[PDB]
Nucleic acid binder design. Structure first.
Ligand SMILES: CCN(CC)CCS(=O)(=O)[C@@H]1CCN2C(=O)c3coc(n3)CC(=O)C[C@H](O)/C=C(C)/C=C/CNC(=O)/C=C/[C@@H](C)[C@@H](C(C)C)OC(=O)[C@@H]12
Ligand SMILES: [Mg+2]
Ligand SMILES: [Mg+2]
Ligand SMILES: [Mg+2]
Ligand SMILES: [Mg+2]
Ligand SMILES: [Mg+2]
Ligand SMILES: [Mg+2]
Ligand SMILES: [Mg+2]
Ligand SMILES: [Mg+2]
Ligand SMILES: [Mg+2]
Ligand SMILES: [Mg+2]
Ligand SMILES: [Mg+2]
Ligand SMILES: [Mg+2]
Ligand SMILES: [Mg+2]
Ligand SMILES: [Mg+2]
Ligand SMILES: [Mg+2]
Ligand SMILES: [Mg+2]
Ligand SMILES: [Mg+2]
Ligand SMILES: [Mg+2]
Ligand SMILES: [Mg+2]
Ligand SMILES: [Mg+2]
Ligand SMILES: [Mg+2]
Ligand SMILES: [Mg+2]
Ligand SMILES: [Zn+2]
Lengths: 115, 7, 304, 152, 59, 108, 219
RNA sequence: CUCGAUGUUGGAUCAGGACAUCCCGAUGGUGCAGCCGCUAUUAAAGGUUCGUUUGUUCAACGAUUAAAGUCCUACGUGAUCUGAGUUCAGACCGGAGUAAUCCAGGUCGGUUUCUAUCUACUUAUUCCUCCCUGUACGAAAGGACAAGAGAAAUAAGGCCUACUUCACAAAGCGCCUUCCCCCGUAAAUGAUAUCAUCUCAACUUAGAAUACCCACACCCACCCAAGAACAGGGUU
């Protein structure tokens, strides 16, 4: 799944996110004891010569059976303590993110679609 | 003669 | 010289022998089905600290199971074909910490055995058995030989421990055996890709006993502890056990009550001897589940 | 390591092994007898049984025709097959070929075996005939057998 | 009555019987007290095994 | 790699004489009632197999010279006939071949 | 008649008692759940009871790519591209948290497995959720849409052009060159299909399965 | 000692050991209110990250973690590996020198042998989330420790019902199980020394087992989820 040195596409609508740049977003760290990153796990992402925390929406590996798989990876920006940068995410996201809504309440609120 | 043995 | 039976008889006589021995052993089993009509030993109730003789079963395969919360648990099916007791021993006769019983497993040909064990099985009254495993037990749980052990010896909501022989891989490399990192592939590695590399130091001048290196792996009696039962089916004498267990399919496995500190005292609600279906006021259902298992035929779950 | 592998490695590849046993089968089908190393005929026995099973379908089945065309290289034995061997075993469902171990090869000292379609023309083999019913033990066996029949 | 034997001094605490199983970390020492509690015969057994000569007749 | 001491004759003798290196004496032989020679249990009598093979080879020579070349395999059963025998009503339609000898004790 | 691809067991050896038990269990469940007949390439709509969702119910429509596994663990894959992004689900058709299945459309593709739709154009898998069930006559043959599919450029994941897959929906006449197809036919292994000891005859066990299904149904 | 040859640095694999403890454990003191910290005693069971340039060990830097410990093992380990430095034969530059040639000056490149004879050998922890709790403590600010519940990572041992690499089976990226403490101190009564004094005074307290294996000439031959051979299980 998501780990160090993985080209990710930011999905939310943010200037910092969708600003074109000669290098694509790349995961350089995951905040877990192991290097893999599953849904609902904070990671660290390099954009435009700086680095910010992020939260990965969905990975293209097969996790649990009926949990969704995405043909392309996804991730959304977020501040240190859970303040999302993007305003909304028109793309679908897993329902397994609102399980931890106690921490990602605003990220779940700014979403539209769910699968 | 070559560093080695025996390059 | 040494020979076998099939050679010194005729083709018209071979099926006769086959059907005769089959009838004989099946009649023995039918006769020993009911121990209460025989002379049973004194029965005692459960006490704290006491134990129960386990049994041995035959692994068929694996299956999924769902809870009421919808979460999954994989489960092994252990079958019990005959599983009769073979003998009893006294504490001061076996010179051990605790008394011991012996339980048999799979019924097999009476021809491919030794004369001593054949005589033992005859004087006991039953056919031969594949494995004859030993169970430590207090004296209060003394069970008579010639008694069948059915799947009702265990119940759901129960924790259990299972012992069996592992898969035989033969002589394998240090990597697959112990899980060493090995050596890289490219960058000039000359004939050193899966090697163990170093073994010991230079001053030691020797290799320590118990050092890891290639050898036979598997085909040893390994045990798993703390498993849990989800379902019992009686007519087939099969039991569920969570997770997985050692051994290949159709292998004989030993099963016993779990010995863990948390899973040791719960022995009052269960039969302290085995389950005797005869003599009971009622006959149990075909299958029986744990209360937190969605039963097939029930409606699909719908939270709130 | 292998557990449950039914095939065995024979030549320098899968193509090579199926070609080898194809030649063995093409030589066996016409002589309805052939001696060869034990393992080769062991694995080819099933191939031959399946081959006559698909030849039972007849000359009309394009599938079976293509299969026989592949398996037989002489192209003169598949009509022989459909017209002789399938009619020969039209009644039987199994036990089409007998396989018997024989002494080793002269110089190589390899274990060999002869395989032979049942109901051939050429002379039979010296098969192992089971001991006679007139023997002492067989007679005692028949004695208690008739005793049990009389009882029941 | 090897169980009811007595040392001179604090030997039960000061004396140590040491042995190496053969494996790394298999070096283990036990005081005479522990060794008596686990096996009352082993103390006198080892004492005699030491007094005796080191030939094959010792066994 | 290289040795360091010449291995002694007594240790070499123990090695090459241990029972693992010795030959197995096998109690798996008996006489064939037909020929009277000795044979392994599961193996056929070499003498009988040899004579059968000789007969098969000679009748193969005969059928080959009869067919007269390759790619002449017929699509019918075939039957052998020895001197002093007539074809049967059963095998009239089957191919027949002639042979200059008499029916042995074992072949039908 | 028609049999499901999960009642039949796998080539592996084991006691048929296992198969019998899992079969009677899935049939005791079939008495409740309908699992409307379908194939690969059919469009299915599924409703499931999820503990966290609006109303705790989840709807999903998608094309069936494959049906895998045997026994109770048997699953089917669904795929759908929405908002330009392609999602896939692996549904267990015996889980109790699935509420019901529905066949919006029933079709069969030339390719038994349709995992190449990942590299195919998104418009082939672009199916809307609001489309209603195409009602099919109660007793008719299965419609087989004989078509071919265009694909993304070569930078693929699975290398579909090889002959081991034995697939035909793709259009490699356009998607690649004569030279590349001639180079791909290198791996052609005719002895696979010409061999006769590897296949698995099913008539016996499928007949037994028909028997047991009829028995448990009428019982 | 070794020049009738004891093969280097760093790195890879494997790690063994000491404790002068980096983390986790238990205690005393504090210029310790609490969370934070400093020091000292005991504790070596267990663990001790990934990358950027550099040959690099070190060092600097980025992100982390409970931690990113010191050292010995022929500066452990080249009959297991690599050869990037150092570096024979070639060459350029700066300098020395008439020149040949040289510079612990740099710079590009530059073959790493062995069929094993003998000894030896070859089956449980930790972080995090929730109540404790905005509690005690603390002017406020700040802010727990215990007990309990849950979910995870690591290490070990196993498994194929999902999934995946695959397909009569083997494997992981997938699934299941994993239970004991540690001794330094703080306390009672009380004598030498009649108070007192935790006791190298007698005394009272906080203080491993269990589990696994277990019988035997039928045994030519065949099969095997057993296996290099031998061996082992089955042949009803
Ligand atoms: C920077 C040095 N590098 C690059 C040039 C050379 C690597 S080296 O150290 O291994 C080489 C061989 C041994 N040397 C010692 O200084 C040494 C120290 O202790 C010893 N030798 C004793 C032994 O090692 C015992 C062994 O039996 C000796 C062997 C196998 C020697 C074989 C022949 N090697 C030579 O003649 C080497 C001559 C030159 C190359 C020198 C100088 C450059 C320093 O290098 C060494 O001898 C070097
Ligand atoms: Mg920059
Ligand atoms: Mg590797
Ligand atoms: Mg080389
Ligand atoms: Mg190589
Ligand atoms: Mg070969
Ligand atoms: Mg790929
Ligand atoms: Mg010398
Ligand atoms: Mg030397
Ligand atoms: Mg210390
Ligand atoms: Mg500390
Ligand atoms: Mg060194
Ligand atoms: Mg070093
Ligand atoms: Mg060395
Ligand atoms: Mg080195
Ligand atoms: Mg180099
Ligand atoms: Mg260099
Ligand atoms: Mg210099
Ligand atoms: Mg080398
Ligand atoms: Mg070697
Ligand atoms: Mg892993
Ligand atoms: Mg006093
Ligand atoms: Mg006092
Ligand atoms: Zn003979």
């Amino acid at each position: 799944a998501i780990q160090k040195m993985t080209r990710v596409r930011v999905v939310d609508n943010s200037a910092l996110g969708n600003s074109p740049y000669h290098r694509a977003p790349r995961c350089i760290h995951v905040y877990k004891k192991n290097g893999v990153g599953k849904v609902g796990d904070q990671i660290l992402l390099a954009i435009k010569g700086q680095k910010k925390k992020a939260l990965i929406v969905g990975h293209c590996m097969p996790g649990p059976r009926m949990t969704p798989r995405f043909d392309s990876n996804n991730v959304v920006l977020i501040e240190d303590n859970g303040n999302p940068v993007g305003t909304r995410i028109k793309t679908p996201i897993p329902t397994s993110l609102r399980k931890r809504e106690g921490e990602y309440s605003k990220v779940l609120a700014i979403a539209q679609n769910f699968v | 003669x070559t560093x080695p043995f025996x390059x | 010289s040494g020979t076998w039976w099939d050679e010194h008889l005729s083709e018209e006589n071979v099926p006769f022998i086959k059907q005769l021995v089959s009838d004989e052993d099946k009649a023995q089993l039918a006769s020993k089905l009911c121990p209460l009509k025989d002379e049973p030993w004194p029965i005692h109730p459960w006490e704290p600290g006491s134990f129960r003789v386990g049994l041995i079963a035959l692994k068929l395969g694996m299956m999924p199971l769902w809870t009421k919360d919808g979460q999954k648990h994989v489960v092994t099916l252990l079958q019990v074909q005959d599983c009769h007791v073979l003998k009893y021993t006294s504490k001061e006769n076996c010179n051990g910490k605790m008394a011991t019983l012996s339980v048999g497993g799979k019924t097999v040909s009476r021809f491919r055995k030794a004369t001593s064990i054949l005589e033992f099985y005859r004087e006991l009254g039953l056919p031969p058995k594949q494995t004859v495993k030993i169970f430590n037990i207090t004296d209060n749980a003394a069970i008579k030989p010639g008694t069948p052990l059915y799947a009702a010896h265990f119940r759901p909501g129960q924790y259990v421990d299972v012992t069996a022989k592992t898969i035989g891989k033969g002589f394998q490399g240090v990597m697959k055996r112990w899980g060493f990192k090995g050596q890289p592939a490219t960058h000039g590695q000359t004939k050193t890709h899966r090697r163990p590399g170093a073994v010991a130091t230079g001053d030691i001048g020797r290799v320590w006993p118990g050092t890891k290196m290639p050898g036979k792996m598997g085909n040893i009696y390994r045990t798993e502890y703390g498993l849990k039962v989800w379902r019992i089916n009686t007519k087939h004498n099969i039991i569920y056990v969570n997770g997985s267990v050692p051994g290949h399919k159709n292998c004989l496995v030993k099963v016993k009550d779990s010995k863990l500190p948390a899973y040791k005292d719960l022995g009052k609600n269960l039969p302290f001897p085995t389950y005797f279906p005869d003599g009971d006021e009622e006959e149990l259902p075909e299958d029986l589940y744990d209360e937190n298992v969605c039963q097939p035929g029930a409606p699909s779950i719908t939270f709130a | 390591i292998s557990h449950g592998r039914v095939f065995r490695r024979m030549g320098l590849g899968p193509e090579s092994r199926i070609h080898l046993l194809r030649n063995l089968l093409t030589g066996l089908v016409r002589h309805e007898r052939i001696e060869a190393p034990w393992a080769r005929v062991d694995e080819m026995r099933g191939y031959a049984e399946k081959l006559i099973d698909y030849g039972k379908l007849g000359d009309t089945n394009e599938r079976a025709m293509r299969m026989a065309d592949f398996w037989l290289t002489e192209k003169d034995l598949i009509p022989k097959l459909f017209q002789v061997l399938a009619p020969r075993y039209k009644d039987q469902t199994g036990g089409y070929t007998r396989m018997l171990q024989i002494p080793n090869r002269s110089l190589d000292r390899a274990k060999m075996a002869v395989i032979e379609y049942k109901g051939n023309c050429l002379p039979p083999l010296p098969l192992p005939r089971r001991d006679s019913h007139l023997t002492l033990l067989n007679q005692l066996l028949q004695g208690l057998r008739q005793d049990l029949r009389q009882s029941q | 009555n090897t169980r009811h034997i007595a040392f001179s001094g604090n030997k039960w605490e000061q004396k140590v019987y040491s042995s190496h199983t053969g494996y790394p970390g298999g070096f283990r020492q036990v005081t005479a007290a522990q060794l008596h509690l686990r096996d009352p015969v082993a103390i006198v057994k080892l004492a005699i095994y030491g007094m005796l000569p080191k030939n094959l007749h010792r066994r | 790699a290289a040795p360091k001491n010449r291995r002694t004759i007594e240790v070499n003798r123990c090695r090459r004489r241990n029972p693992q290196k010795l030959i197995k004496v096998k109690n798996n032989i008996d006489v064939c009632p037909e020929c009277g020679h000795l044979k392994q249990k599961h193996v056929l009598c070499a003498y009988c197999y040899e004579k059968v093979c000789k007969e098969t080879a000679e009748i193969r020579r005969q059928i080959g010279k009869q067919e007269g070349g390759p790619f002449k395999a017929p699509t019918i059963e075939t039957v052998v006939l020895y001197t002093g025998e007539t074809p049967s009503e059963q095998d009239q339609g089957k191919r027949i071949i002639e042979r200059d000898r008499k029916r042995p004790s074992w072949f039908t | 008649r028609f049999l499901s691809p999960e009642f039949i067991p796998r080539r592996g050896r084991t006691d048929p008692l296992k198969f019998q038990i899992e079969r009677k269990d899935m049939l005791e469940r079939r008495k409740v759940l309908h699992i409307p007949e379908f194939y690969v390439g059919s469009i299915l709509r599924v409703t499931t009871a999820d503990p966290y969702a609006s109303g705790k119910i989840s709807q999903f429509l998608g094309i069936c790519i494959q049906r895998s596994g045997r026994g109770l663990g048997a699953t089917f894959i669904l795929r759908n591209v929405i908002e330009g992004q392609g999602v896939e689900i692996c549904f267990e058709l015996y889980n109790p948290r699935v509420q019901e299945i529905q066949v919006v459309k029933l079709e069969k593709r030339l390719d038994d497995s349709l995992l190449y739709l990942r590299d195919a154009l998104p418009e082939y898998s672009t199916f809307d959720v609001n489309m209603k069930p195409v009602v099919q006559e109660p007793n008719q043959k299965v419609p087989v849409n004989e078509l071919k599919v265009k694909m993304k450029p070569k930078p693929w994941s699975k290398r579909w052009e090889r002959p081991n897959f034995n697939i035909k929906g793709i259009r490699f006449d356009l998607c690649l060159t004569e030279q590349q197809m001639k180079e791909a036919q290198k791996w052609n292994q005719p002895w696979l299909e010409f061999d006769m000891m590897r296949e698995y005859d099913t008539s016996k066990i499928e007949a037994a399965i028909w028997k047991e299904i009829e028995a448990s149904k009428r019982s």
